[PDB]
Amino acid sequence: DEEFSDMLRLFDFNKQAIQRLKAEAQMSIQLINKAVNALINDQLIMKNHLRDIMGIPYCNYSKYWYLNHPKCWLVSNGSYLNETHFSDDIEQQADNMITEMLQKE
Amino acid sequence: DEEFSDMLRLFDFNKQAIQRLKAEAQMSIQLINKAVNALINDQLIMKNHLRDIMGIPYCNYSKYWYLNHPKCWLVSNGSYLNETHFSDDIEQQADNMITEMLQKE
Amino acid sequence: DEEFSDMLRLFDFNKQAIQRLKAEAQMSIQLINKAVNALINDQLIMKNHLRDIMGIPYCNYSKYWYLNHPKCWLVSNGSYLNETHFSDDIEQQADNMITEMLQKE
């Protein structure tokens, strides 16, 4: 049981690295989603006020196949990005995994 | 060979965490790239139609050194973001690594 | 000390996966921040030149609680995204951790 504790200590360091990287990348992405969402907000305001471009329409579903490529608005009110949350049960199934490992020992 | 199986089980859990985090972060980024690309699209349409701002030019290469800081367009047709795909050979070199580990045993 | 070297080799492969994923995700995000920042730049230029929309004001702090939801500019000069750098001391505390592991052995 002494060699398995060193095993766990290696395992746990990496598990912590994974946990921290998720936490930081998520923070970083959520900050991105906030700016991209607010750009969208303001860009839809200008599209409703600027008279030169009120004549231009929004693309309709044919939009999900101009990404495989188009003079129409791609950004609409559905263009908003949803909050991004990664799976966080790392500290859970890991506790489970090794508890099943100790009930044989 | 019984202590090495517990080693592998710890190793494999973390490997799976890494694989899932990559998969989710990538999904999350690719969704970002789609909104940022379509903003760019529409913003370049407004730049070609709004008459008040047709007089403003696009910055020319001196643009890659206003990021170290500028009344000209930074976003042009080269501003699009490329599809982001992370390395995925995790399930490959890991199989290789431990197969070389078992042919001595 | 022969079973601990296989332990370390498993540990080190995953540590490398973590290091590479951080490196790639960061590259990917920093590219995003550059496009989102330059969109912001240009969008603030159009907000200062287009006469149809000079009458529209910027939201004032009541902005950090329209994200819980608003006809005012959400994107201002504070909207820029800061350079994102993830913790990179992985190759450091890992060397520390196992050096303390070898001074007992």
Author numbering:
A (entry chain A), B (entry chain A), C (entry chain A): 306 to 374, 381 to 416
Extract from the study:
The two RNA segments in its genome encode four viral proteins, including zinc-binding protein (Z), RNA polymerase (L), nucleoprotein (NP), and the surface glycoprotein precursor (GP, or spike protein). GP is cleaved into envelope glycoproteins GP1 and GP2. GP1 that is responsible for receptor binding (including α-dystroglycan, heparin sulfate, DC-SIGN, etc.) and GP2 that mediates membrane fusion interact with each other to form a stable trimer complex on the LASV viral envelope.
After the single mutation of C310S was introduced, the trimeric LASV 6-HB protein was obtained. Then we continued to try different truncations and deletions in 6-HB, and finally found that a deletion of Gly378 and Lys379 in the T-loop region could yield protein crystal with enough quality for structure determination. Taking a rod-like shape with a length of ∼75 Å and a diameter of ∼40 Å, the LASV fusion core contains a parallel trimeric coiled-coil of three HR1 helices (gray in Figure 2A), around which three HR2 helices are entwined (green in Figure 2A) in an antiparallel manner. According to the structure shown in electrostatic potential surface, the HR2 region of LASV can be divided into two parts: a linear N-terminal region and a helical C-terminal region. The linear N-terminal region binds to two adjacent HR1 helices through hydrophobic interactions, consistent with other fusion core structures, as previously determined. Moreover, at the junction region between linear and helical parts of HR2, several strong hydrogen bonds and salt bridges are noted. These relatively concentrated hydrophilic interactions constitute an anchoring point in the middle of HR2 domain, stabilizing the linear and helical region of HR2 and also the whole 6-HB conformation.
